[PDB]
Fold Putative oxidoreductase Rv2002.
Amino acid sequence: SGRLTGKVALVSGGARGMGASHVRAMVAEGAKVVFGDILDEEGKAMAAELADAARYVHLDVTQPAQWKAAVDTAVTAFGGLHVLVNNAGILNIGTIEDYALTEWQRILDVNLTGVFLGIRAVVKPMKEAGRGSIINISSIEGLAGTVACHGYTATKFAVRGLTKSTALELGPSGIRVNSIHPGLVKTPMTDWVPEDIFQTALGRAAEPVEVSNLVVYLASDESSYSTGAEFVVDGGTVAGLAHN
Amino acid sequence: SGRLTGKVALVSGGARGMGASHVRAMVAEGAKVVFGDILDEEGKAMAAELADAARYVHLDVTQPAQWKAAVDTAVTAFGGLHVLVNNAGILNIGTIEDYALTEWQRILDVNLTGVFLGIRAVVKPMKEAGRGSIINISSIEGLAGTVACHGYTATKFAVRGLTKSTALELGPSGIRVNSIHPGLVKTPMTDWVPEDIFQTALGRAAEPVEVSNLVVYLASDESSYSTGAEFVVDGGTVAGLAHN
Amino acid sequence: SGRLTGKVALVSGGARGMGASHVRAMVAEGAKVVFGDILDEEGKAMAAELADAARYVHLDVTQPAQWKAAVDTAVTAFGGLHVLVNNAGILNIGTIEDYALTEWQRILDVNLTGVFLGIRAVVKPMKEAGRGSIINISSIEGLAGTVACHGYTATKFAVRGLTKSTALELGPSGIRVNSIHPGLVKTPMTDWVPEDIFQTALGRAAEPVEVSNLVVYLASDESSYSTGAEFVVDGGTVAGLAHN
Amino acid sequence: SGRLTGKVALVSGGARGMGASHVRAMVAEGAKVVFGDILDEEGKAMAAELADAARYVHLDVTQPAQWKAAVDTAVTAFGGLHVLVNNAGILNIGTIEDYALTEWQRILDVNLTGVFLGIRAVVKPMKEAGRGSIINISSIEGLAGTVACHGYTATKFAVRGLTKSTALELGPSGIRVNSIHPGLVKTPMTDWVPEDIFQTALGRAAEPVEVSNLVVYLASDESSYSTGAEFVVDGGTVAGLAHN
Ligand SMILES: NC(=O)C1=CN([C@@H]2O[C@H](COP(=O)(O)OP(=O)(O)OC[C@H]3O[C@@H](n4cnc5c(N)ncnc54)[C@H](O)[C@@H]3O)[C@@H](O)[C@H]2O)C=CC1
Ligand SMILES: NC(=O)C1=CN([C@@H]2O[C@H](COP(=O)(O)OP(=O)(O)OC[C@H]3O[C@@H](n4cnc5c(N)ncnc54)[C@H](O)[C@@H]3O)[C@@H](O)[C@H]2O)C=CC1
Ligand SMILES: NC(=O)C1=CN([C@@H]2O[C@H](COP(=O)(O)OP(=O)(O)OC[C@H]3O[C@@H](n4cnc5c(N)ncnc54)[C@H](O)[C@@H]3O)[C@@H](O)[C@H]2O)C=CC1
Ligand SMILES: NC(=O)C1=CN([C@@H]2O[C@H](COP(=O)(O)OP(=O)(O)OC[C@H]3O[C@@H](n4cnc5c(N)ncnc54)[C@H](O)[C@@H]3O)[C@@H](O)[C@H]2O)C=CC1
Ligand SMILES: C[C@]12CCC(O)CC1CC[C@@H]1[C@@H]2CC[C@]2(C)C(=O)CC[C@@H]12
Ligand SMILES: C[C@]12CCC(O)CC1CC[C@@H]1[C@@H]2CC[C@]2(C)C(=O)CC[C@@H]12
Ligand SMILES: C[C@]12CCC(O)CC1CC[C@@H]1[C@@H]2CC[C@]2(C)C(=O)CC[C@@H]12
Ligand SMILES: C[C@]12CCC(O)CC1CC[C@@H]1[C@@H]2CC[C@]2(C)C(=O)CC[C@@H]12
C-alpha cells in the first residue's frame, strides 16, 4: 500500500486479462497508470472505474506513432513516466507445414517488434528522470519449447534476449529492464486450455493477481539491484524434468 | 509496513552481514524472527535491540541437533514457523593444486549440507501449518564459474539444484522453495574485494538491504506462484557476456 | 573420413566464412553438398573446385521460392536431403535510439525468418526418409546480452527457441534439430573486431574449422541421441562471470 | 577409426555400464585406456578381451591414493595421460524426511568429491603435456529437479558447476573441461526404470554407445574450441516443457 506512490506507468494490452490486473494492482499501490489496447470499448469502460488515477488510450503496439501518443499522454497528464509494462501479445499455433507465413509475421510484429517499439518510446522520458523500470512479459515458452508453437516460442525467447541487451545499455542511465515468465494463468487467452496442462509443483493454474504482485515488485524501487534477469512465476513447471 | 505480519521466520547466519539485514528487514515488516549463528556476542547484542520481536540462538548449521533446538525455539516462543532463510555460509579460495581437501570438505559441510539440514528441520512444522517459504541463498557463482573458487562454485551450484528437487517434493504440501543469487554485496565476507570486480550494468556493488527486499518478497504471500526458481539480484552481471 | 558418406546436405550462406568452411569439411567427410548464397561470383568459384561433390545455387534465405529451388536441386541432383545447416546471417549494430527500424526488420528477416523458411522447406524430404539433422547457427549472443546489439541478440535468442519447438515436433519423424553457439570466429563478418574482445579460457579466437568440426558431428549419426540442445563452442566465455 | 590414436585415457567406473562402453569405444578409435572401478572381477575380465590397449586398476574414486596409482599406471604403461572421463557414480533416492544423512554423505563423496579428486590427480601430467581433455559425467538431473532425488540432483548440479570453474582455471594450460548430461540410458543403474519415464522427442531411451560417441568427440581434438560447456544427450527431454 503506497509502494508505487509517485510512479507513473504505461501498460500495453491493459484492457483485459493480466494487463487489466496489472493496472488495478499498480493503482492500488499508489501509481498513476496510462494503459493502452485495441479493445476501446472495454478500455474506456474500466478507465471509468479507476477514474482520475488512470487514463485509457488506443494503442496498437505495432504503430510507433501511437506509442508516442501514449507516452505524451502519460507525461502531460501525470508529469512523467517511470514504468513500462510490455504486456500486449497474441497467441497462434500450427505445425511447421501448415503454419501460415502471415501468422508468423503477425506474431513477430506484435510479440517482438511491439516490445522493441515500446522500449524505444519510453527511454527519452526515463533517461531525463534518471530512473526507470521496464518490465517485459515473456513466458516459460521463452525458456523451453512446445510442439506447434513456433512463432510464440521464437518471440518469447527473443523478448528474453532483448531484455538483456537493453538492460546492459540502459543500466548506466539508471533504467532497469527485466523479464517475467509466467506459466498457465487464467485469462481469455487461455480459457480454452485445461488448467492442468502443465506439470506444476503447486498443482494449479495461477490467478492473474499472482503475476501482478511480481509486476508491482519489479516496478517498485525494492527491486533496485535486479536488472536483465528472468523472473519465473510458473508454479514449478520449469524447475522439474518432464516425466510420464 | 506489515507485509509479513503473522509470519515466524528462522534465519541462519543472522548475526552479521546480509543475515543481520534480513532479520531487521523482516521484523520491520511485522514478522517474528529467530536467528542463529556462531558469533554469540554479536548475536545477543542485536537480539537486545530487537528483544520483543526476535530471539537469538546458537546455531552451527552443520549440527542437526542445533537445528532442532532452533526450530523448537521458534515454535514454542512464537507459535509456529513459516519462513526459513538458509543464509549461513563461508568463502574460501584456492587453485586446483594448492586447495586443501579439508577446506573442500569444510565448505561442503557448511554451504551445502548445512542448507539440506535446515530444510529437513523445518518441513515438519511447515507441513502442519500448511503453508511455508524456504529461501536458499546461492550466488551468481552458482550460475557461472570463477578461477580458484572450486569449493564455493560447486556448493552454490548444488544449492541451486537442491532448491529445485525440494520445491517439486514440497509443492503439494503448500511449501515453496526458491533460491536467491546475488552479485557483489557490501558485507564483511567481501570487504577486501574491490567494489567493481564484476562488470555490472548499474555500475556499483549492492547494499545488503537491496537483497533483503527480495527476501521479504519471497517470504511474503505475494510470491505465492513462484517456486523452484532462481531470483537474480546482481546488477546485470550474468545478463551480459564477458568483454575486455 | 567417410563419416558423412551417403549424406546430402544443404548449407545456406555457404559462399564464404564459416559457411564455406562447413561445405569443405562435409565434402571431406564424404557428403554431397548443395550450398546457396547471394554472392554468386564467389559461390560459382568454389563450386568449380569442388566439382562433382557440390552444387551452388542462388539462395536468398528470405525468399521461400528460392528455398524450394534449393531443395529440389539437392533431391534431383543427389537423390535426397538429410542435413540442413542454417548458417546464413547478418550483423548490424546500434543503440536503442539511433537504430533504424529498417535495420531491425532486415535482421529479423534474414536471421530469424530465414531460418524458419529453411526448416519449412526441408521437412518434406526429411520426413519421407524418416531421418534428418537440422543445425541452426545461433551464437553466444543468443545466451547473454551485449550493448547496442538488440536486433542480433533478439534473433539469436529466437533461433535458440525455434530450435527447441521444432525438435519436439519433428522428433517422432526421426529428425533432430540442434543449435550451435560459437564465440568469436575469424571470418569477414568480424575481421574488424579485435580477436580478444571476449574473455576466454583458451585465450584466443576460433578458427572456422573448429566450428565446422561440431557441424560434422551434429550432421553425422554419431549424435543420434542429441536433439533440441545448445552446443557451445566459445572457448569458455559463457562459462565464466564477467570480471574487470 | 584412429580418431584418438596416440591418446591415453583414464576412465573411472569403467567396469560396467556406460563406463565400460566408453572404454570399448575409445579403444576402437585407437586410444590406450586405463580404467578403474571397485568391481575387480568384472574389471579384470574385460581387461582380458581388450588386450594391451587397456589396463584395469582397482580405483575407489573417494581415495586420493588410488587415483595417484591409477595415474602412475597410465603414465608408465602408456607414456602419458591426455583424457580423463569422470564417469564413476552412484544413485540413491529418498524423500526429504526419510533420507539418511549417511546416504547423503556417501553420494557427495562419490559423485562430487570423487570428481574433484580425479581432476586434481590428472592436472600435473596434462599440464606438462601442454594439453588435455577432462570429461565430467553429469546428467539432466543436473539441469532440473526430480522428487525424492535430492542427493543425486545436488551432486549433478555441483559437477556441472565444478566443470566451469576448473575449465576457466585450466584453459591457459591447454586443458579443456566439459560436462555431459545424458537422459535415460540402458544400464544396470536404471534397468528397473521404465524406458519411457521421461518425455522425449525421439520416443525412446538411449543405447550407451550413443553417449560414448559424445565422449569420443569431446576426447578428440575435433572439439578443440569447446570448454566449460554442457553437452546434452537426452533425446529432447529438457528442450520441452512438462505437460500432462
Ligand atoms: N494467458 C496465459 O496463460 C499466459 C500469458 N502470457 C503473456 O501475457 C500477456 C498478456 O496475456 P493475457 O492477458 O493472458 O492475454 P489476453 O488475450 O487476455 O490479453 C492480451 C491483450 O493484448 C491486447 N493486444 C493484442 N494485440 C495488440 C496490439 N497489436 N496492440 C495492443 N494491444 C494488443 C489484446 O486486445 C488483449 O487485451 C501476453 O504477452 C501473453 O503472451 C504469458 C504466459 C502465460
Ligand atoms: N558477501 C557477498 O558478496 C555475497 C554473499 N552471498 C551469500 O550470502 C550468505 C551470507 O553472506 P554474507 O552476509 O555476506 O557473509 P557473512 O560472512 O557476513 O555472514 C555469514 C554468517 O554465517 C555465519 N556462519 C558461518 N559459518 C557458520 C556455520 N557453520 N554455522 C552457522 N553460522 C555460520 C557467520 O558467523 C556469519 O555471521 C552466504 O551464503 C554467502 O555465500 C552470495 C553472493 C554474494
Ligand atoms: N563471425 C563470428 O564471430 C560469429 C558468427 N556467427 C554466425 O555464423 C553465421 C555465419 O557467420 P560468418 O561466416 O562469420 O559471416 P559471413 O559474413 O562471412 O557470412 C554470412 C554469409 O551469409 C550470406 N548471406 C547474407 N545474407 C544472406 C541472405 N539474405 N540470403 C543468403 N545468404 C545470405 C552472406 O553473403 C555470407 O556469405 C551467421 O549466422 C552468424 O551470425 C555466430 C557467432 C560468431
Ligand atoms: N544410467 C543412466 O540412465 C544415467 C547415468 N548417468 C551417470 O553416468 C555414470 C555411470 O552410469 P551407469 O553406467 O548407468 O551406472 P553403473 O551403475 O552401471 O556404473 C557406475 C560404475 O561406477 C562404479 N563405482 C561405484 N562407486 C564407485 C567408487 N566409489 N569408486 C569407483 N567406481 C565406483 C560402479 O562399480 C559401476 O561399475 C554415473 O555418473 C551416472 O550418474 C547420467 C545420466 C543417466
Ligand atoms: C495453451 C499453451 C499453454 C499456456 C501458454 O502461454 C501458451 C500455450 C499455447 C500452445 C499450446 C500450450 C498447451 C499444449 C498445446 C495444446 C499442444 O499440445 C498443441 C498447441 C499447445
Ligand atoms: C570476491 C569474489 C566476488 C563476490 C563473491 O560472492 C565471492 C568471491 C570469491 C572468489 C574471488 C571473486 C573476485 C575474483 C577472484 C579475486 C579471483 O581473481 C581469485 C579468487 C576470486
Ligand atoms: C563483434 C561482436 C563479437 C562477435 C559477434 O558474433 C557479434 C558482435 C557484434 C556487436 C559487437 C561485439 C563486440 C563488442 C561491441 C563492439 C560493443 O562494444 C558495441 C557493438 C558490439
Ligand atoms: C530413475 C530416475 C531417471 C534417470 C536417472 O539418471 C536417475 C533417476 C533417479 C530418481 C528417479 C528418476 C525417475 C522418477 C522417480 C522414480 C520418482 O518418481 C521417485 C525417485 C525418481
Q: What stands out?
A: Residues 15 and 43 of chain B are 5 Å apart (CA to CA). Residues A 12-13, 15-19, 37-39, 59-62, 87-90, 110, 137, 139, 182, 184-185, 187-190 surround NAI (ligand 1) (CB under 6 Å). Chain B has six helices and seven strands.
